[PDB]
Structure formats: C-alpha cells, structure tokens
Amino acid sequence: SGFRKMAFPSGKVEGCMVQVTCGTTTLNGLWLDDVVYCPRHVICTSEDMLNPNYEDLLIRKSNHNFLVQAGNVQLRVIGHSMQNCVLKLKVDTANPKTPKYKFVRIQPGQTFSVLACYNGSPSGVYQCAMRPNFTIKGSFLNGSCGSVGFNIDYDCVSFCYMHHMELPTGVHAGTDLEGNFYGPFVDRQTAQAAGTDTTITVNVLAWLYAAVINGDRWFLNRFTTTLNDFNLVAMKYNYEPLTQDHVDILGPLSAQTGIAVLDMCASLKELLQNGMNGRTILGSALLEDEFTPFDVVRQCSGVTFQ
Amino acid sequence: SGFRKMAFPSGKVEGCMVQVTCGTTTLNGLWLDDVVYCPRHVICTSEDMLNPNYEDLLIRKSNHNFLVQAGNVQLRVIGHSMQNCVLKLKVDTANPKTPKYKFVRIQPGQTFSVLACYNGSPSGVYQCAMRPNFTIKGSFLNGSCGSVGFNIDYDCVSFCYMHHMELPTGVHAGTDLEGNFYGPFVDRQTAQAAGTDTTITVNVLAWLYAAVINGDRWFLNRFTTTLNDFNLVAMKYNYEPLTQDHVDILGPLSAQTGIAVLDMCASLKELLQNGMNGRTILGSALLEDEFTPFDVVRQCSGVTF
Numbered sequence A: 001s002g003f004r005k006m007a008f009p010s011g012k013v014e015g016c017m018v019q020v021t022c023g024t025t026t027l028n029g030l031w032l033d034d035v036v037y038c039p040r041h042v043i044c045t046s047e048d049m050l051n052p053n054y055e056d057l058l059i060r061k062s063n064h065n066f067l068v069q070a071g072n073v074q075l076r077v078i079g080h081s082m083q084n085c086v087l088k089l090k091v092d093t094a095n096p097k098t099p100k101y102k103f104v105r106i107q108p109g110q111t112f113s114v115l116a117c118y119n120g121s122p123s124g125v126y127q128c129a130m131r132p133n134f135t136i137k138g139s140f141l142n143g144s145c146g147s148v149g150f151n152i153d154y155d156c157v158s159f160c161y162m163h164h165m166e167l168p169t170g171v172h173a174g175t176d177l178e179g180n181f182y183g184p185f186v187d188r189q190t191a192q193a194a195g196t197d198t199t200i201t202v203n204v205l206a207w208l209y210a211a212v213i214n215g216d217r218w219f220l221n222r223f224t225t226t227l228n229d230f231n232l233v234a235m236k237y238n239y240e241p242l243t244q245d246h247v248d249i250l251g252p253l254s255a256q257t258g259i260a261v262l263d264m265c266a267s268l269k270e271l272l273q274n275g276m277n278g279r280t281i282l283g284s285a286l287l288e289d290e291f292t293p294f295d296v297v298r299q300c301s302g303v304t305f306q
Numbered sequence B: 001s002g003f004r005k006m007a008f009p010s011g012k013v014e015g016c017m018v019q020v021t022c023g024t025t026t027l028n029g030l031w032l033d034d035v036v037y038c039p040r041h042v043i044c045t046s047e048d049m050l051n052p053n054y055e056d057l058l059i060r061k062s063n064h065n066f067l068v069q070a071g072n073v074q075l076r077v078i079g080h081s082m083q084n085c086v087l088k089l090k091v092d093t094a095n096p097k098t099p100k101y102k103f104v105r106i107q108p109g110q111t112f113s114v115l116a117c118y119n120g121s122p123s124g125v126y127q128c129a130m131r132p133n134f135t136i137k138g139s140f141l142n143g144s145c146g147s148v149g150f151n152i153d154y155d156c157v158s159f160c161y162m163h164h165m166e167l168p169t170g171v172h173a174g175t176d177l178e179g180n181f182y183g184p185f186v187d188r189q190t191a192q193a194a195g196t197d198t199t200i201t202v203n204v205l206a207w208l209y210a211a212v213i214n215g216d217r218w219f220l221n222r223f224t225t226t227l228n229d230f231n232l233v234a235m236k237y238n239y240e241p242l243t244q245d246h247v248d249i250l251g252p253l254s255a256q257t258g259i260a261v262l263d264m265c266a267s268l269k270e271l272l273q274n275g276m277n278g279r280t281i282l283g284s285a286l287l288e289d290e291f292t293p294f295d296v297v298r299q300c301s302g303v304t305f
C-alpha cells in the first residue's frame, strides 16, 4: 500500500548522459550507439537567438567545433546533422552502456520521468506530465538543456522528451527525440507564452481510484452522472473534458474497485463544488493529475484495501 | 525555475539489486562487494513470523538454501551470517558494479531516495523522509522487502534504509544497513502501530525558502518571533520543535533570500494559526515537509552526481 509520485529508475538513462559544448554554450547530450542527440540551440551565438537560421549556422560548423565529453573522456565527433530542433553528432565510439531504447512521441496527459542534468552529469530524477498546453512543469536551471524525459517499460527505455527552454511563467518546453516541439513553441528567444493550462481529468479520476484502492473513501457518493453533465461541470473548473476513450481506459480501475467511472465522476463533481474541507486524499489537499490510469495500475496492487 | 520532489539518480544502486529466495519467500538483496544484504525475515515461512527465533532458524539453514540471482545469473552463496535484522549472504563473486558506498544511519526529518524493487528488479524511484515517528510513507507492494533507501554525496552512495514491513495504517518500517530498525518496530507479525506523526518544521521552513526562491512570496509577513515562542506554537499544532542547529542549517537560505529564520518562523506561525486562505505555495495547499534545507540548496543550485 501507499501512493507516491514515482519516477522510473534512471540508471539506463544516466549511462547515456554526456556534455556537449559549442563555443561558449555547454549543455547535455544523449549518447545512444554512435550518435549524441542534443538541442540544436547549442550552436547559437548570442545575436543568433532571436531569429537563428539553424541550417546556415550548422553549415558554418565543423566536427572540430563540437566538444563532446562522456565522463572524463572526450569523444571524437565525426559527423553532424540536424533533425528538426535536435542536433545529431556522430561520434567515433558507440556507447557501451546503450540500453534497449525507442523514441516515442507522447500526447498531453502522458507522464514520464525526467533525468535533470548539468554538464552531462545527472543531478536528480522526477516525475511529471505533459500538460494539456504542451508544457511541462519541471525543475530546471540554466545548463539543464538536453536533459531527457523517458519511460521504461519492461527493460526498454522510451525517450519522449528533450528539454529545450523555459517560458516566461517558469514552465518548460521541449521536443521529442526527433526534434519536433511539443506545442506551438519555437527554439527562438521570440515572445512565447503557454496557453492557459487545464487539469488532466482522466488522471484525476485515476488518482481517485488509487485513493480508493489505498483505503480512502470519504469523497465517495451515491450519485452518478452522464458523461455530458460531468463535462459541463468539469470545464467550469478548467478541467479538460473526459472522452469515451478515457472512460474505457478507466475500466480496469472501475472493475477493481467496484465504482463505475460515471459514479466516480459524480464524486469528482462534488469535490470540485465543496473543496476538501480540511481533509486530504492520499496526503494531498489538491486533486493530483500527474498519474495516468496506467501509472495507477502499475503502482497499485491487485486486491483493493477494504 | 520550478520545484519538484526529486530523487537522486538511482543507477549506482540499480547495479546492486539482486533477487534473494529462501524457500517460498522471494525478496530483494543489495549486492555490495562479495556480500548480499537482505531482510532476515526471508528465512521465515508463515508460522515463523508469528514468534520467530531468527538465530535458530538461521542455524538450520545451509548456503545452498539461499538462491541469489543477479540478472539472469545465479550467484553462489558461500557463507551466511546475521547482523541485527539483516541477513548477510557471502557470495563467490564481488559485484563489479559496486559503487563507492557507506552505511549511514539517518535521523527523523532526513530525506532519502527509495529504489522500489520486485524480484531484484528496480521498478521505481521516489523521494521520502524519515518521519519523526520513524516510519516512511512509502509506496510498496508485497515483494518489495529489501528495497533500499539512499543518498549520494559527491560520487558516494550512502545506504540508509532497507524496507522490512508495512504497518496496519499503510506506512512503512525498516532498518539501516546494519539491521537496526528505525523506530520501535520489530520484524514479527504482531500488533504494531506507529506513534502519532508530527510535521518536520525545519523542512517546512526550507520549503518556504524554496518557494521564495521561486517567486512565491504572499506568505511573507513583517513579523519575527523568538525560537521559544515559535516552538510553543509549533508544539500546539503537532510540529516538531525547531532547534538552534536547525536555525544554523537554514542560514544560507536566509542569506540568499534576505528573510531571517525567525522572520520565516513568524510566517509559518501565521500559516498554522490561519491556514492558506485558498492560496497555494509551490502549487501545494499543504505545507511540504519532505525537503531538507540541503535538498532545497542542492535543487535551487544544481549540484550533480
């Protein structure tokens, strides 16, 4: 029993973290096989940050301009190419610690672990969700660029995020490992703002099921609702609408706890209306939305605590 | 910017996790050098746990009764001994992935990362604090025993916890790596209950400093308090007393933010007597107490491992 925001063990990603230096810029790279992936903005030189022409800046670079360091060993860059907003540095050594991996593009509401790095050295690991506005609420200081988001499912690392920038509100933006940004963001210092963030409703419902599995029940009620009436109330609290796909994915938790999805939806409807009244759910006074239905099933047992 | 509950990178510990099987019981072991450490209750069946004589159960065991598996390789147990509530299995192979390490006993309020494991395989890493009642509010299912708690200092792993059991309230109990339980717990299936938990006051203050570093400052007030008047109020709300050592350890955060420790205490004093009033601090409606002053400095400065 118990419920924690749990990150995947970061060891498989730690053995891939390297330091990439281009001129005065130093950030992190992900060394997989004989390729080092990093944000392409490592090549930007002060006046090439408002409107950088990356194709032109990269053409002017040689392999000898990129300094790649893996621990206390300097890797030899033998090629460089760009794929969207990610720079790929071909090196003369395959990473002997390369895990089984894949590059996956995730959708909002999905969770992943972040291995925060500085100068190619891992400093911390935390769990977060891709917000509906395509930002992540990370914890990153200058030098964290190139830090990666990942999931580990059954021996294989799925790389889903690479950190590129911090927006004016302190939230973070990045790309998948193919260099495509999540959200309407660009790797330019031009005026950028995240859209108004909203609550990942399916994740709140999954977390309420986790609370019931862990013995919490005070928020439960005898009501049920239609999916449409629930969505009408939820959107008034900046909660995202719940689709039939979300109701289906909540099915196993519904079967495990004996609380139908729309029965739980009526409990969430009441929680939004009254507040918590000095009570907590899984030690939290706010509704948690960074646990997917998959995370709750992964973390929780097969038998519900009665 | 941003503030997250952050665990140490778990790689150095992952290379030490092995599966230990004794009879029908399977749990996790920590393979360091040529020794596998695990909870001694792996020698227990079902009746044994009700009233166990571990010295007697262990004497009846032979090295071949212990099945130790590191990945898909079986390790040969060549010796077995007990140190308090931990079983030490001498193996014929030193772990080539043994990091620089030490065994440290932590105090309540101190934080550490937990590498939750099942069948010697790491499944998750999370950060938690040793509660003042010596329990940890972990997330553990059956098979998680032997999962370890650790911190990292420079390139050295300090092992501070090994999971042994779950109490009736769902909170967890375990030992240091020398087998000594944290708290008044015993490794037996008997009526046990954690004492009433209290809030780690120095950690709340550190988290308030982290909020000020991140621009969240609505709770700051003009007031200050004495350490004695603060403690009188804190005791009343089931908050741990704040000592001069805590005030000293909060010194760098005080210097960085320009808010004296006793100035921040008057802020906490008001938050306790009045609540948050519909506001949040670092996105939380409750005061967070699982970040030490060192965790806040480490995160709001980027110390790497």
Ligand SMILES: CN(C)C(=O)C[C@@]1(C(=O)Nc2cncc3ccccc23)CCOc2ccc(Cl)cc21
Pocket (backbone or CB within 6 Å): A107, A108, A109, A110, A111, A132, A199, A200, A201, A202, A203, A240, A241, A245, A246, A249, A292, A293
């Ligand atoms: C991984 N999880 C938990 C998801 O829900 C992913 C996701 C989803 O709906 N997420 C979204 C939740 N809520 C709000 C959102 C706003 C904008 C954008 C997405 C939002 C992503 C989109 O495609 C599907 C399709 C099918 C299912 Cl079952 C889920 C999803």
Ligand SMILES: CN(C)C(=O)C[C@@]1(C(=O)Nc2cncc3ccccc23)CCOc2ccc(Cl)cc21
Pocket (backbone or CB within 6 Å): A025, A041, A042, A044, A049, A140, A141, A142, A143, A144, A145, A164, A165, A166, A167, A186, A187, A188, A189, A190, B001
């Ligand atoms: C290093 N270089 C070349 C930069 O320009 C990085 C930078 C950035 O956001 N870095 C940051 C990441 N994450 C956290 C941070 C915290 C504080 C301070 C900075 C942080 C800073 C300037 O604004 C942009 C704009 C667009 C892109 Cl893609 C990157 C950036």
